[PDB]
Each structure stands twice: as C-alpha cells, then as structure tokens.
Design a protein around this nucleic acid. Structure first.
Lengths: 95, 93, 80, 107, 98, 88, 93
DNA sequence: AAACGCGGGGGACAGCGCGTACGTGCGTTTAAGCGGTGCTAGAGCTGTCTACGACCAATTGAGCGGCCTCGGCACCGGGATTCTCCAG
DNA sequence: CTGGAGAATCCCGGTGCCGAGGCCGCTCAATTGGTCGTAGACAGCTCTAGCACCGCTTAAACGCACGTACGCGCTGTCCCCCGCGTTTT
C-alpha cells in the first residue's frame, strides 16, 4: 500500500498537465438544459454553446478552489472546509 | 460658459416623491453623476447589441432588452413597465 | 431532476486536484453543487436574453460568448 | 399647431429632446428610434425616484430636512438591489454602513 | 488608582465613532505633496487641481478602506483578532492584485 | 550653530501617519493592529496611486495641457472599474 | 457565403518567427478571437478619447495614446516605436 | 495632533492529546457515450418594398446663468443620562 | 444584583449664518411641417442541424473496509500592542 497523500500528489501532478474536461458531458448537458428551462421554455442548444458553457464552468470552479485552498492554508490547515469557500466567496465580492 | 445638466428635472422628481424634502448641491451633483453613468452604460450596451444583430437603428426593443440585461431583478421588471407604459402613452399621444 | 448530483464526487475531486487540493472535506461537495448553480443560472438567464431578443429559438455560443464577456469572463476559441 | 413637449406627451418629466440630440451626437448608432429616447427617459425617472424615495427615507431617520451623500450612501448600500447595481460605484464623502464584526464584540 | 479602561473598550468606542463619521482621515498637506512627489516619475512639473487633489484621497481611502474590512475578515477566519500583513497580502492576492 | 541642516528627513511616504492609519483602520472596523502594518500599508497605498496617476497623467498630455484636472482623474478611475460620483 | 478572418496574416507572421512550426485550428480560432479583442479594446477608448477632447476625427496619436493606456510599460515602448516606424515608413512612401 | 515613553496585560503561540473522518483500495455495479439511423424544426437565405427617420427650414420658450434672503443647520453649554470599570 | 466613581453621551434651548431656493432677463435648442432614400422585417424557399432513440460495452461510478493522520480543544507563557498624559511638531 501507498501511504495516504501520495496518490493525491500524483493525482494533482497528473491533472495539471492534463487539459481536457473533468465533467461528464451528458450529466453536464442534462443539468444545463434543466437550468435553462427555468427562464424560458423549450430552448434549443448549439453543442458549441453547451461546450462553451462547460469550459467556463470548470474554469470557473478550479480558480475558486485555489482561492479556497489559500484560505485553508492561511488557517494553518491542509483540509479545505466550506467556510473557506464562503470567506473566499465574500472577498471577491460576489457573495 | 454654458453648462447643461439634470438638476432641475431631478428637483422636480424629488418634489414628486418628497414634496417637502430639501437637497444639498453636492448630492445633486452625485445625481447628475449617477444619471450620466447609467445613461452611458445602457446606450453603448444598446449599441453593441444592434451590432450583434447587425442592425443600424436603435429602438425600444434594443433599449428594453438591455434594461433587462442591465437592471437586476425587480428593477428591470418594474422599470420595463415604466418604459412600457410611457411608450404606449407616447404612441397614443 | 438532480442533474446537479450528476456532477459526481470524482468529477468534483478531479477539479480540485487540477486545482491543486490535497485533502478534501465531505461537506465540500454539496457546497460546490449549490454555488455552481449560481454561476450557471446567472449566465443562462442572460444568455437566452440574447437569444430571445435575437428572435431565435436556438442557443448559439455566440450569445454565450457575448454574455460571459458581459459578466467579465472573456473567452477565446468558439467563433469570434 | 401648438408646441407640446414630448415629455408632456409621454406624461414624463425628463427632457427627451435633450437626449435624442444626445443620442444623436452620442454615436451609438447612425440612426436612432423615436421611442428609445422616450423609453429610456422614463425609466430614468424611475430609478432617481427609487433612489430619491430611499434618499428621503434615510433623511428622515436622522430627522434632517435635506438629503446628503451619507444618506445616499446609506440608502443604496442599505438596498441590496441598488448595492448590487452600484457595486463598482464609490460614493464621495458617503462614509460606511456602521457594522462591527460579531467576534469583535466583547464577551 | 488611575481609571484606565480595559484595553479594547476604547477601540470599540473608536470603531463606532468613525463609522458614523464621514470625513477624511488623511491630512491634506502631507497628502498632496505625496502626489506631487509621485508625478515626477512620469512627467516633470505638472500643476495640480485641488478638486483633483481632493478627488485622489477618496479613492485613496475608499480603496484602502475596503481593503481593511476584508483584511479584518481574514484574522477572524484565521481565528485571530489582531491583523497580520499575511492577511493583507492574502486579500490582495485573493483580490488578484499582486 | 550647524542647525540649518538639522531636519532634512521628510521622505514623504511616512506622511501617512500611524494615528491616521489606525484611524483609518478604526473606521474600517479593525480592533487591534500589528505594528508592521503601517509600513506595509504605505506600500499598498502607493502602488495603488501611480497606476491611476500614470493613467491620470496619461490623459493630460494627449489634450496638450499642463494642469491635471479632476475630470481627467475622474476618467482615470473609471478605466480600472472603480467609478466615483460627485465631481462631474 | 464568404466570412473573413485573420489566420492567413497570422500564418505569414508565424513563418516570420517560426518558419517551420505548425498551428492547430483550435489554436487558429483562438488567435482570430484574440486579435479581434485587442482591436476592440483600443478601438473603443480611442473613440472615447476623441469624445473627451471634443475632437471629431481619430488619428494615430489617439491610437498611440490608447496603446499607452493598455499595454504594460516595456511592451508599450516597443510597439509605440513600431507604430512610429510604420507610419513613418508609410508616410515616407 | 502627533510624538513618544511606558507599564501592563492579554492574546498570539507553541505544545499536547486525541479521535474520527478521510484517503487508500477495490470489487461491483453502472452509467457514459458513440455511431447508426429517423426526423423536422427553424434558421438562414433572397427579394422586396415601404414607411419612417434623416434631412432642412422656421420658430419660440424652456432652461440656465445671474441674483437675492433667510432657514436649515452646526455649534455651545449645561445638564441629564448612561455606562464602564471596579466595589461589593 | 449593583457601581462607590469617574467618564462618557445624548438631549435640550440659543446662536449665527450662508446656501437652498424662488425670482429675473435672454438665447438657441427643442418642436413643428415639410422630402426622399433606405433599412429591415416579412413571406417563400431551402436544408441544416437539432432532437429521438437504440443497444452495447467498458470505463467510471459506487458503495464499501480500514487505518492514521490531521482537525481541534485546551493551557500556560510571554511579549507586543493598548490607554494615557505630557512634550513636541
């Protein structure tokens, strides 16, 4: 067995040179259509539009993580917690 | 030199809402400051959409959508009514 | 219908890995799921506002690009 | 005939003729619709009153008779809609909402 | 014995005072020469308007003010009550300003 | 004698004084302050300043003047997306 | 129909710096998108610039000045000279 | 008002124990997607023509400088209250 | 509970004042009645793409064990920043 925290580093090392998506398209696609339903009914999507959406979302998500990670570290931790997000979400001022 | 501004109209609206409240001058300048901003932000936003659909003339369809784009939530909802009411009133009058 | 949950934990965990996160709580996953909706909902609301005003019933990415810029996230690579 | 202002015609207060000129020199388009100067101009009245009414409210809460930016600062920043609208607006001499952190309160 | 307040009660009183106050906290004469100092590294020998000279401070403060309250958020989350620069820099980095 | 040169130590940037700094912090709502903050603040404020000032001056020459106007700096502020109301 | 872009002018320049380097279409779309932006960012301000001095015709100075508004420091010094050279080369012949 | 000294006290800080959640791992599902086949909405195109704004000319009044006056408002003092330490 | 006690704060009535606010001439921008060119929405045609589904196979999810490392609660300890009264600045 590898000791805990080794695979994660290799996982982290692995993905930072990896570049394609990390979210499943159909679970991505379905959720998009559900959410879009709430503003107007019976839309129709260009795959580009959905794909363009997807690039934004992950690109969105990752940066917040780094901010949250910085928050966690500043609390002298290595374990992120939701308040770190909220503290992060506050400071960027969209909270 | 001549300088044209918006104080008088703002002064009229205040006496509509608070017919008795006074006002400073600096705050009035703020109001002049504020109006011109939102004046600007809508218009260029209004312009570029006409660009997005490659049209050449800006009407209320243009104006309203950006108001929905620019104003958030209830203001956009309520103000569109404010826009909608006047337009029909103008066309009728 | 729970398509938010369709974003699996490994889907979440992969992103944080690419984000550089070594150790993750368990409450993180639901926190993420709610917030990401906010990102999506805000965009898609405004995105269709283009599509409606443009008098279509089909969503172009060109609208999507327009909006994400209008939010302030400029994006390259999908037409214009 | 008899000269009748468009603002009167819409039953509005804001000078639409001013803006139709201003739109005309504003180089936002080479042609401009007629109700657009109108359409915006009323909504212009809406927000000012919307803020002005708030400006009146806070003005009363310290029992003054004349509105100041501190009142304006308070009003918009007390309004979550306006504050979300004017998040990139900083107010001259407006000051800050009084708010002390919970943990700074003494045991 | 002298009547000294418990340390901090004075500060909370102070915190209250300024949060109702609205005036500047930076002395004008030190302030403008700072700008007059700064202008030299761009263009020599300019001539400042007081309105401009004034207008600088508000941004100068309002900027730094919003900084403070965010920095205050830091130590709270970092479970402190005394602010550290590591907090200050952190926000600016979170503000993405380095 | 030798007193004509006894005070040459201005070096403006401290002109933003610790009492003000804390006064500033007190309006912001901070209760207790590290001592190294004062100096660190001096950095943050200055680095802020020129970037606008550069941009603020950046206007001036283009219109062929020599006196900085508030309106000029008014535009200076807008470009970085921190707008101000109240100086026209 | 016929819709236009910049990739060809890109590709000569590519061959000016890297005469034996390929480029993907996903990349080529990125450059087309990228160049379009950089045009737009300056294009507006210089347009705005004209309004600021109540002048009524865009020139290279405004472009020159506008570039000084965007590009950081050392790079600005480069291109402004290159902007300076080309018109000089243009104006000379 | 800042400077500046100065005691002093409180909170950072380090160390410590500990307990449990979270990574490791991995079969067991399981669900993700592809390409193949079916379909039609609907967008995109052309042509067209019309109606309405751009245009000019004549005009007047609204709006903005220029000018007055007093009323909101900021002290000032005192006194009244309240609160904080600091008794108890 | 209750504060000796000092100190702090709010409120009550006076003062002074100057700026908000109506008044007062004046001009040029906003409003009215004309023309003509084009923009642009709208029917008709085209056809692309969007959607619908299947079926199958395998990665990828998923639902568990286990173990230990890190999150956190706690406690003296030490030292830096907090209140304050002059002394400069």
């Amino acid at each position: 067995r590898y000791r805990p925290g080794t695979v994660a580093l290799r996982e982290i090392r692995r993905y930072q040179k990896s570049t394609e998506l990390l979210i499943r398209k159909l679970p991505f696609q379905r959720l998009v259509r559900e959410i879009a339903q709430d503003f107007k009914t019976d839309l129709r999507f260009q795959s580009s539009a959905v794909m363009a959406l997807q690039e934004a979302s992950e690109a969105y998500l990752v940066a917040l993580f780094e901010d949250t990670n910085l928050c966690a570290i500043h609390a002298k931790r290595v374990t992120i917690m939701p308040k770190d997000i909220q503290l992060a979400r506050r400071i960027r001022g969209e909270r | 030199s001549r300088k044209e501004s918006y104080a008088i109209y703002v002064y009229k609206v205040l006496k509509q809402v608070h017919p008795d409240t006074g006002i400073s001058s600096k705050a009035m300048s703020i109001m002049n400051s504020f109006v011109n901003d939102v004046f600007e932000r809508i218009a260029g936003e209004a312009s570029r959409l006409a660009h997005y659909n490659k049209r050449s003339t800006i009407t209320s369809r243009e104006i309203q959508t950006a108001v929905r784009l620019l104003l958030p939530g209830e203001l956009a909802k309520h103000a569109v009514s404010e826009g909608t009411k006047a337009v029909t009133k103008y066309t009728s009058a | 219908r729970d398509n938010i949950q369709g974003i699996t934990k490994p889907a979440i965990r992969r992103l944080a890995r690419r984000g550089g996160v070594k150790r993750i709580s368990g409450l993180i996953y639901e926190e993420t799921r709610g917030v990401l909706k906010v990102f999506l909902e805000n965009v898609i609301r405004d995105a269709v506002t283009y599509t409606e005003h443009a008098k279509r019933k089909t969503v172009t990415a060109m609208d999507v690009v327009y909006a994400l810029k209008r939010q302030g996230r400029t994006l390259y690579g999908f037409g214009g | 005939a008899k000269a009748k202002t468009r603002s009167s015609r819409a039953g509005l207060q804001f000078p639409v003729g001013r803006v139709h000129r201003l739109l005309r020199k504003g180089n936002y388009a080479e042609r401009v619709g007629a109700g657009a100067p109108v359409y915006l101009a009323a909504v212009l009245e809406y927000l000012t009153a919307e803020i002005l009414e708030l400006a009146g409210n806070a003005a009363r809460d310290n029992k003054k008779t004349r509105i100041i930016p501190r009142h304006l600062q308070l009003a918009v920043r007390n309004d979550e809609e306006l504050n979300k609208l004017l998040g990139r607006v900083t107010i001259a001499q407006g000051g800050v909402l009084p708010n002390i952190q919970s943990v700074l309160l003494p045991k």
